[PDB]
Amino acid sequence: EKLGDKSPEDIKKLLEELETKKTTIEEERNEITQRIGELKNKIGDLKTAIEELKKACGRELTDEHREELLSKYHLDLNNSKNTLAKLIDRKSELERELRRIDMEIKRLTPLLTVAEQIRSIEEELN
Amino acid sequence: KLGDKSPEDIKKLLEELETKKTTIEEERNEITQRIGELKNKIGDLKTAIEELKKCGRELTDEHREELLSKYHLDLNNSKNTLAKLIDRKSELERELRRIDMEIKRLTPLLTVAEQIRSIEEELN
Ligand SMILES: [Zn+2]
DSSP states (O other): OOOOSOOHHHHHHHHHHHHHHHHHHHHHHHHHHHHHHHHHHHHHHHHHHHHHHSOOOOOOOOTTTTTHHHHHHHHHHHHHHHHHHHHHHHHHHHHHHHHHHHHHHHHHHHHHHHHHHHHHHHHHHO | OOOSSOHHHHHHHHHHHHHHHHHHHHHHHHHHHHHHHHHHHHHHHHHHHHHHHOOOOOOOSSSTTHHHHHHHHHHHHHHHHHHHHHHHHHHHHHHHHHHHHHHHHHTHHHHHHHHHHHHHHHHO
């Protein structure tokens, strides 16, 4: 028997390790997904309030602070857009890791029944 | 008596399960995002209702109490939407759990249904 790599319990353990990683990451992907939804809504309302006061509540009143309120909204807008972008990027970093993980399981699971069979053989020798 | 179905029959049932897993994880993922949208909408509406009870100055007090009944109206409507989404998200996670069990169950029954067919290959 020419054994390639290692034993049937080395790879039962590498599968346990991947399944652990799958759990904690799916959880974080799920959470980010919900935080991405909060930001998109926030950003939606900010856009449609910068609209609703542009071009002279929602009454024009004192125009001499009504552009500090644009510098407020724009700041609250950009800051949110900045946040969102980092979360969208992290969400697909997680989706990449999960894909990587799913493949390694797909690879190892037949390699389990193969290391199962090499061991079954060495049983009949002795 | 052989296990009641064939490898080709259960290769097939696992494909139909995996198809279901895809479309439901997708819907789950989408609800997860819309729930976040509503949770933020509702946070702001609560924060805005308390912020006039406390520009956003005081002005008229006989149209600024129908703006509490339009905040409340926009608030309850959202809370109603959210509850149906939270409920539908866990019905999806229930299906997904069921699905994952079938796969976990039928995948050993695969190697067995073909282990039987491998035997019948040597009879004949
Ligand atoms: Zn006002």
